Amino acid sequence: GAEEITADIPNVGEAALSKLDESGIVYIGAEVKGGDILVGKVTPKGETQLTPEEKLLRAIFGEKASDVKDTSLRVPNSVAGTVIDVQVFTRDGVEKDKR
Amino acid sequence: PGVLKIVKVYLAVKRRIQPGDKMAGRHGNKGVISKINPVEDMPYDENGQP
Amino acid sequence: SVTEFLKPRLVDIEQISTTHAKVTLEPLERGFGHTLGNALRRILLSSMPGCAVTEVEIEGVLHEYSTKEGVQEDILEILLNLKGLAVRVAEGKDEVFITLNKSGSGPVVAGDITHDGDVEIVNPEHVICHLTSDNAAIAMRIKVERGRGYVPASARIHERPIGRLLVDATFSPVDKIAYSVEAARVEQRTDLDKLVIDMETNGTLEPEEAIRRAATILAEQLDAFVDLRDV
């Protein structure tokens, strides 16, 4: 399928989305540290043949798997700075996001 | 071809001087900082200027 | 006698300038001049409490690495100028907020900062910014905190809204310390010494108070030496 830039990142809470906007891109002037998400991107993934103990865990605790995996742009380790500019380039014919 | 979107982020980092950084003059006298000494521990003159 | 020493006492506080002073201690035994001078110089240059600018908030500014219309200097330069601001906070308060709202053309100096009376600016002629247009306006909200030593922005423990610009704080008000040991004209004894300590500061900390605080710190650690028991 088509890889999508969005804020609906699976298996990630709210604190990691605090610096992300509605589109999925951090604001200008955000203080970020290593491991922080800058651009939220979800990638379609194929079926996973989960191991028996894993399906035990899924049966007991619920938490059904999603169709997208988290492949997002994260700040490199030991790097902490301020976002000073964001540039978005879109192919012709693709919906230009809000940002 | 094949790409739908590109997002580019510029990060600004203020790097301070720390041990291991390489400092030099203009006469081939390079060096690596070994310690950031406290002010009171460094040599000073009669007027008190360290 | 050979057992009882002469206790030094404060003699004269000479205030040459707002940021420069001399303190005279007299009398002192042979060799005690250098000992006390070096101890006091090391304590004063190391751990004096003081008030410094910690965080700033400027309207229309999201980060340090940006400019503002009608403002000649970048925001990073404004923060570097704010680091060189001498402020005295009344005792009992740790964190205070001051405001700098100025519109017009000319040099925005520290004398235009509005304070609630618990904060006194020592250098009203410090140039903070330059406004180059008649329609240029600057509106800043500065946090001043009391501390000791040097605390960079990184070392501060970690919500913080985008727009709050953290500033490295040098709380220590002492810039230069010099000391000299000279002869003391005592009534009878002629082996006595006088210690003259020249202190160049930012004007925040008074000389007499600084000397007593350094002596107090040395006394507290020498107390743990005096007792000398296993813990």
UniProtKB/Swiss-Prot annotation, chain B:
Covered range of the whole protein: 1044 to 1093 of 1341
Superkingdom of this protein's organism: Bacteria
Quaternary context: The RNAP catalytic core consists of 2 alpha, 1 beta, 1 beta' and 1 omega subunit. When a sigma factor is associated with the core the holoenzyme is formed, which can initiate transcription.
Function: DNA-dependent RNA polymerase catalyzes the transcription of DNA into RNA using the four ribonucleoside triphosphates as substrates.
Coiled coil: none
Protein name in the entry: DNA-directed RNA polymerase subunit beta
Family: Belongs to the RNA polymerase beta chain family.
Biological source species: Vibrio cholerae serotype O1 (strain ATCC 39541 / Classical Ogawa 395 / O395)
From Swiss-Prot, chain C:
GO MF annotations, alphabetized: DNA binding; DNA-directed RNA polymerase activity; protein dimerization activity
Gene Ontology terms: cellular component: cytoplasm; DNA-directed RNA polymerase complex
Organism: Vibrio cholerae serotype O1 (strain ATCC 39541 / Classical Ogawa 395 / O395)
UniProt-listed Enzyme Commission number(s): 2.7.7.6
GO BP terms: DNA-templated transcription
Subunit structure: Homodimer. The RNAP catalytic core consists of 2 alpha, 1 beta, 1 beta' and 1 omega subunit. When a sigma factor is associated with the core the holoenzyme is formed, which can initiate transcription.
EC class of the enzyme, as a word: transferase
Catalytic activity as recorded in UniProt: RNA(n) + a ribonucleoside 5'-triphosphate = RNA(n+1) + diphosphate
Signal peptide annotation: none
Protein task: DNA-dependent RNA polymerase catalyzes the transcription of DNA into RNA using the four ribonucleoside triphosphates as substrates.
Region (Alpha N-terminal domain (alpha-NTD)): 1-229
Superkingdom in the source lineage: Bacteria
Family as reported in the entry's similarity comment: Belongs to the RNA polymerase alpha chain family.
Protein name, UniProt field: DNA-directed RNA polymerase subunit alpha
Keyword tags: DNA-directed RNA polymerase, Nucleotidyltransferase, Transcription, Transferase
Domain-related comment: The N-terminal domain is essential for RNAP assembly and basal transcription, whereas the C-terminal domain is involved in interaction with transcriptional regulators and with upstream promoter elements.
